[PDB]
């Protein structure tokens, strides 16, 4: 009974699978040219240092699982097949921990490296996923104290690794303020200012055209030299009612502000999401309980919620009301139906811990944990401890 609670819990101890995910996050406000020189520097490392395992790397930029923007990129790393890389160091768990330690040399990006779980339709990352379901009832962007707890104050990792954001930090933006009084007092109407600023920078889409027998689109935008700087805001002209051109900086100024490039709504409140894995050596249940000493530091209103592939750990958990409490409950009935007694079906279920006493020992000695394969293994050993009992108690009860 003590050794049952001494073992930790998990769910599907995952496999190599030859695949590896790696996302980058340059600091906010970075261009795509700054992201590309990190993505290519990550790409060249895996093809000469880790050529024993890595077969081919496919890097996209502008998009990862955390979000989208010019400050985001990711890599699908497909490894060698199972017979071309022998040795336990060529596993993805020993490639990931030695590539993640190398990625701390890259200074201008929070580069990560992780594996998906054993199931692929469920989850895209091994380890826990917890959402900061922050039910404080506050206004929609006065909830920045949830972010303040989300940065490092929920990242006090005693035995975790690669605890990472899944949103992204807020960045500077350029608020373009146009006064309609002065602009209208020079004759130029405001709808033309709206159409000019929406076509020149916003890449309007006018209608469709056809080439090679396929219908495609025709877009309309200013040239790249005219939309790079705030001073390039002052290069565009609008025609007033008298028919002459007013510059754009005669009635419009600019001012820097600070805003988030990604906004969510999770179960009625905008949450922030945290991904992370357990350290090499321990299971997933003690990691999901080792974040419970981190969640006890929390402000008002917020809470933690397990979801995704971590929803089953806290909705299934241990099925002590149902699993191996109503399974072997009915075998006492179905053996009373065949033994025609009260005490001799009790005797053959009395010997049931003598099978699980080594079923716990084998997973304790190999270092595994309590997962669903361990549960269905125990559900065989109940029947195994029963079939040795019944085969030698049937002859004991017929001969009497």
């Amino acid at each position: 009974i003590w050794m049952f609670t001494r073992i930790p819990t998990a769910f599907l101890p995952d496999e190599d699978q030859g695949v590896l995910f790696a996302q980058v996050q340059t600091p906010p406000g970075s261009s795509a040219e700054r992201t590309q020189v990190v993505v290519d520097s990550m790409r060249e490392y895996l093809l000469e240092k880790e050529s024993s395992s890595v077969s081919s790397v496919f890097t996209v930029t502008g998009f990862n699982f955390a979000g989208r923007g010019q400050s985001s990129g990711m890599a699908f790393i497909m490894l060698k097949p199972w017979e071309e890389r022998p040795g336990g160091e060529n596993s993805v768990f020993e490639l990931a921990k030695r590539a993640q330690m190398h990625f701390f040399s890259f200074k201008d990006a929070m580069v990560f490296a992780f594996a998906p779980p054993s199931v692929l339709e469920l989850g895209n990352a091994t380890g826990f996923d917890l959402f900061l379901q922050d039910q404080a009832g506050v206004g929609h962007e006065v909830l920045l104290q949830a972010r303040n707890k989300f940065l490092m104050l929920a990242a006090q990792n005693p035995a975790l690794q690669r605890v990472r954001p899944n949103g992204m930090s807020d960045e500077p933006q350029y608020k373009l303020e146009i006064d309609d009084e002065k602009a209208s007092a020079l004759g130029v109407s405001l709808a033309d200012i709206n159409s000019t600023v929406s076509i020149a920078w916003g890449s309007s889409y006018v209608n469709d055209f056809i080439d090679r027998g396929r219908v495609k689109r025709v877009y309309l935008q200013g040239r790249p030299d005219a939309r790079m700087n705030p001073d390039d805001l002052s290069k565009w002209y609008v025609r007033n009612d008298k028919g002459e051109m007013v510059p754009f900086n005669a009635f419009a100024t600019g001012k820097w502000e600070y805003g988030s490039p990604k906004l969510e709504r999770y179960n009625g409140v905008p949450a922030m999401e945290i991904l992370g894995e357990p350290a090499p050596g321990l299971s997933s249940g003690d990691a999901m309980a080792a974040v419970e000493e981190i969640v006890k530091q929390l402000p008002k209103g917020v809470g933690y919620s397990w979801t995704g592939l971590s929803y089953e750990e806290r909705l299934s958990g241990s099925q002590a009301p149902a699993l191996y409490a109503l399974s072997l409950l009915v075998v006492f009935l179905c053996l009373a139906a065949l033994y025609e007694s009260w005490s001799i079906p009790f005797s053959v279920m009395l010997v049931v811990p003598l099978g699980v006493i080594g079923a716990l020992l084998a997973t304790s000695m190999r270092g595994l944990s309590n997962d669903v394969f361990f549960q269905v293994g125990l559900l065989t050993t109940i029947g195994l401890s029963a079939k040795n009992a019944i085969l030698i108690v049937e002859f004991a009860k017929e001969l009497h």
Binding site: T363, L378, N388, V393
Partner: peptide, 28 residues
């Protein structure tokens, strides 16, 4: 491993205790 280690102790123990528990004296 959970079924190998579960079966070996279900064999080398229960052959001593299932005859010990059929002869439980409450079955008068």
């Amino acid at each position: 491993t959970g079924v190998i280690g579960g079966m070996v102790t279900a064999t080398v123990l229960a052959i001593f205790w299932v005859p010990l528990f059929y002869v439980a004296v409450s079955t008068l």
